[PDB]
Every structure is written in C-alpha cells, then in structure tokens.
Amino acid sequence: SCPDVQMISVPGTWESSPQQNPLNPVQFPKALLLKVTGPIAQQFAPARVQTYTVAYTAQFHNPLTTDNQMSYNDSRAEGTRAMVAAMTDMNNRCPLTSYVLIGFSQGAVIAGDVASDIGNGRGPVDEDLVLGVTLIADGRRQQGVGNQVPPSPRGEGAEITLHEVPVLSGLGLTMTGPRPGGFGALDGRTNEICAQGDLICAAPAQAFSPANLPTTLNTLAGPVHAMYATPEFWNSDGEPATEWTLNWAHQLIENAPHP
C-alpha cells in the first residue's frame, strides 16, 4: 500500500549504481546518507515512511585521466531522471503521499535541481507535497538561496564559481551556475549544509588562482568533503551533518499528514 511519506535520498559520486535496489541499498555500505535513511527505516513503520535511495551511475570522469568513468554530465542526468521517475511513480500510485528529499554532493546537485523544479511549479509533483529538502555539499550552493544551516561558510558552489570557465562543459562537466528560480516555493523548506574548506559547495575564486589550482584539483578529485558524518569540519552544537539531517527528517515525518 501507500506510505504516508516517501523519503528520497540521492547518494553522492561513487555511492550508487543503476543496479542497486533503492529499497535495500547494500552495494555501497560506506555511503554517507545511509546514516540517515538507515535509522529512519528503524524509527518508523513502513506504513508511515518508505526510504528510497536513488539508483544511478554516480560517477565523475576526470578528463585528465584515463579512468573508465561516465561524464559528470551523463551521470548527473541519469540521477536526475531516476529521481524524477521515483517521484512520478510514487505520486501516480499514491497521490496523497508527501516527500522528504535529501542529497549529498552530486546527489545534492540533483536533489536541488528537482527541488527547484518543484518549487517553481515545473513538477514532477506539486510543492505542497514536499515536507522539506536538505542538501549536503551542493555544487550549486548559493548564498541567499535556501536556508544555510549555520555554520555557513563563505563562498558559493563550484558550479557557480566556475560557471563562465571555458572548455569544461564541452569536456563533459558543465558548471551550470545559479538555479533559475532558486528553490521557488520550497525556499523556506530547503536547507544547505556545507563545511568550511569543502570546495564543492564553498569555492572562493581564489581557490582557482595559479598558486592554488593544483591543490584545489587534488582536493576536488578526492578531506573535509568526506567527513560529514563527523563533527570535525561542520557541526551544529556538536551534531554532525548526518545527525542534524536525521533529526530534521524525524521531526518532519512525525508531523507529516495522515492521508
């Protein structure tokens, strides 16, 4: 039957595959957002919430290397389509079900993109069905767009800082810049978490100066970005990003409608 709430989780790069079962994501045991969706499935009955972890290639080809990876552009498109498909399917079958959306890194870009569509009335579901959105290490993070969960580092996402750089898009990694329409009606319910020094979501222009560029490329390739389950580089009163998000989601599901 229909869960009152579907919690959709979009993993980061190297944390999903198209073959991973969204209802039982065991292929990538170290994936960050499992620390949120795992406990949620334990704290609530299946009738109250279903967790869904998006199955997608989740890769990021480095053009400077000979890795066998899918381009960022193609991986990101696949994940976006998969996320939209999950929401479309759930809303088709269960029109009264509400949503909690979370994403990390490449998954945060994807989830934020879909949140922007929903908030601007572009679908796949009406905005009133979305309870909340939390984005960890969003590559399109923008000061003034969404709620920056304190502490909020200076700077904006790499896809903003690098939006006008030549060559990258043609190479298969388009830096897509600010989201048109921001999060629209979801602005008040969309949260951005970003740790100081995470160049994915907080990327000062100076990070790409000649002096800093090789270090920056090493950092981006893969660290602060890997530590969001710890309080080391980001915490709220000691609470790591995964714990903040778990508590946030728990409260949304608790107060969710009973259709």
Side-chain angles (χ1 to χ4, degrees):
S1 40
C2 287
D4 293 346
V5 182
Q6 191 184 32
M7 176 166 189
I8 297 168
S9 172
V10 194
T13 313
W14 310 303
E15 296 185 333
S16 190
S17 94
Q19 292 76 41
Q20 181 174 243
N21 189 321
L23 302 183
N24 183 38
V26 303
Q27 190 171 358
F28 303 86
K30 294 172 168 39
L32 185 72
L33 294 185
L34 291 185
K35 300 177 200 305
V36 181
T37 52
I40 282 299
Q42 296 297 326
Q43 300 171 355
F44 297 95
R48 186 61 167 152
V49 61
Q50 166 194 114
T51 61
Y52 186 103
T53 296
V54 174
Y56 79 113
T57 292
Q59 287 177 351
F60 198 129
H61 174 63
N62 185 333
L64 302 183
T65 75
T66 173
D67 69 43
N68 196 31
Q69 283 188 70
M70 181 179 291
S71 71
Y72 180 48
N73 286 350
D74 287 336
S75 175
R76 171 181 172 173
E78 185 188 307
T80 303
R81 294 166 197 170
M83 184 186 180
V84 166
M87 297 195 75
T88 293
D89 188 56
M90 178 61 72
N91 183 69
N92 277 343
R93 301 183 186 280
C94 303
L96 305 179
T97 293
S98 287
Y99 302 88
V100 173
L101 312 179
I102 64 169
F104 169 58
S105 202
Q106 177 171 171
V109 175
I110 290 162
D113 284 358
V114 172
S116 168
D117 285 343
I118 292 167
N120 280 279
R122 314 186 196 112
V125 301
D126 289 336
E127 58 85 15
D128 62 283
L129 293 175
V130 174
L131 304 180
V133 180
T134 292
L135 309 172
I136 302 170
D138 177 14
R140 303 179 80 173
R141 176 180 170 265
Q142 198 173 348
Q143 302 263 347
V145 183
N147 307 310
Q148 316 297 328
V149 184
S152 176
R154 295 292 197 272
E156 296 191 308
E159 294 202 44
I160 315 301
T161 304
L162 302 174
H163 182 49
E164 306 260 286
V165 174
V167 181
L168 300 186
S169 183
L171 287 179
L173 52 130
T174 307
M175 303 291 94
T176 57
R179 294 183 173 100
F183 297 123
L186 292 187
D187 199 35
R189 319 209 278 299
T190 300
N191 306 295
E192 293 274 14
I193 296 175
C194 181
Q196 170 59 39
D198 190 347
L199 297 181
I200 299 285
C201 52
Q206 293 71 50
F208 304 95
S209 76
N212 290 320
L213 188 56
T215 300
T216 290
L217 296 186
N218 284 340
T219 291
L220 290 172
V224 173
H225 186 67
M227 295 286 280
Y228 280 108
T230 86
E232 195 60 45
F233 299 108
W234 188 95
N235 69 75
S236 185
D237 287 337
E239 188 171 45
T242 48
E243 295 293 326
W244 188 97
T245 304
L246 176 57
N247 290 332
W248 163 86
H250 181 102
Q251 174 140 240
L252 283 186
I253 294 162
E254 200 73 270
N255 298 147
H258 286 85

